[PDB]
Amino acid sequence: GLMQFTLPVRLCKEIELFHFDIGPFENMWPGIFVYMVHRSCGTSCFELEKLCRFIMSVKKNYRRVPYHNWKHAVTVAHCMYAILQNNHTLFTDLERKGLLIACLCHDLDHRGFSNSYLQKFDHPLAALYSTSTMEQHHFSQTVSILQLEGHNIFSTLSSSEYEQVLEIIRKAIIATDLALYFGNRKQLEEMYQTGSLNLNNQSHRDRVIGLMMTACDLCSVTKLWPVTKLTANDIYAEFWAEGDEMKKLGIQPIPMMDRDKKDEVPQGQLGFYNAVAIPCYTTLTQILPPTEPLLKACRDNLSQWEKVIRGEE
Ligand SMILES: Cn1nc(N2CCCC2)nc1CCc1nc2ccc(Cl)cn2n1
Ligand SMILES: [Mg+2]
Numbered sequence: 001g002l003m004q005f006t007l008p009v010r011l012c013k014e015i016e017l018f019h020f021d022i023g024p025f026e027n028m029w030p031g032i033f034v035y036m037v038h039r040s041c042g043t044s045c046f047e048l049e050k051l052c053r054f055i056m057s058v059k060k061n062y063r064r065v066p067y068h069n070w071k072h073a074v075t076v077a078h079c080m081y082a083i084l085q086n087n088h089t090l091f092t093d094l095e096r097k098g099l100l101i102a103c104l105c106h107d108l109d110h111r112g113f114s115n116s117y118l119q120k121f122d123h124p125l126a127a128l129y130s131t132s133t134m135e136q137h138h139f140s141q142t143v144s145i146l147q148l149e150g151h152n153i154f155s156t157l158s159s160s161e162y163e164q165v166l167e168i169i170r171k172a173i174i175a176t177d178l179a180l181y182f183g184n185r186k187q188l189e190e191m192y193q194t195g196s197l198n199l200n201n202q203s204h205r206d207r208v209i210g211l212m213m214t215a216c217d218l219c220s221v222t223k224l225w226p227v228t229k230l231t232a233n234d235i236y237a238e239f240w241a242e243g244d245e246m247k248k249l250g251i252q253p254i255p256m257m258d259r260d261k262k263d264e265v266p267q268g269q270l271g272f273y274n275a276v277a278i279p280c281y282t283t284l285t286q287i288l289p290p291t292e293p294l295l296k297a298c299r300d301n302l303s304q305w306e307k308v309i310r311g312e313e
């Protein structure tokens with residue numbers, strides 16, 4: 001009840017910044033998350049004993065893959081924390097509650113393969129969910145864990161507040177299907193520029209939350225350069241393993257997943273920053289001015305990748 005979580009001074013200060021790295025001590029990640037819920041939401045959003053039991057079941061259902069692991073989960077939740085704390089009064093009691101959980105749960109039981117690889121392998125998940133395959137599985141795993149005895153952190157909500165919060169978490173998790181990102185942003189650009197964007201329009205919040213979700217999911221590109229660069233090794237470790245598996249089915253993988261095309265990584269990062277991350281953080285800054293630090297840092301890292309190509313590192 002009167003049980004604040006506190007962090008060492010350096011973590012206490014740095015956690016509030018967009019570029020914060022959660023560090024290499026796994027055992028502090030849960031306490032970092034609870035810290036972030038208590039400051040974001042109030043110390044009374046969730047029964048501490050239920051929250052902790054949920055956090056630990058969530059952790060157990062993330063796998064030891066190089067990128068799409070428990071650390072990615074908490075990184076993506078911290079980005080959302082920084083977005084929520086920098087746009088205090090724009091978000092409902094329920095959105096604050098639901099979006100940090102959506103971020104923690106957004107890649108539950110990921111196997112380190114793309115929606116594409118499930119379909120080409122003919123994985124049962126691909127028969128059961130024809131589009132946003134892994135993303136529907138992720139939401140599906142979230143409801144499973146919420147239904148385990150002692151785990152329902154939403155128990156104090158009304159029947160209707162519950163349905164609202166599970167629907168935010170659903171759309172929020174679906175939104176991290178990057179195939180949907182491109183449409184969603186183009187619509188948000190058009191809407192902001194013609195002046196039609198209305199944050200009381202519930203279909204408009206939906207799109208805006210969808211973009212935050214993409215922005216949090218890609219926050220690897222908004223980190224200090226050594227973090228950005230070492231995270232990229234993990235990303236390519238998954239993608240190249242998928243390319244190996246693609247070749248095993250008798251299929252040329254796309255260049256991004258071919259480990260023979262290591263040499264072209266820097267140029268691949270360029271394409272990705274220009275085609276995906278920069279637009280993402282641009283549109284987000286227009287719509288939510290105080291997120292500008294994610295854009296600035298994204299640009300900085302693009303400039304670091306240009307330096308790599310020019311043999312200056
Ligand atoms: C588009 N593309 N093409 C290539 N290659 C062609 C041949 C060499 C590389 N590499 C890429 C981007 C790879 C990437 N994906 C992600 C996903 C999420 C985040 Cl947070 C960062 N990244 N960085
Ligand atoms: Mg995902």
Ligand SMILES: [Zn+2]
Pocket residue numbers: 072076106107176217
């Ligand atoms: Zn993710």
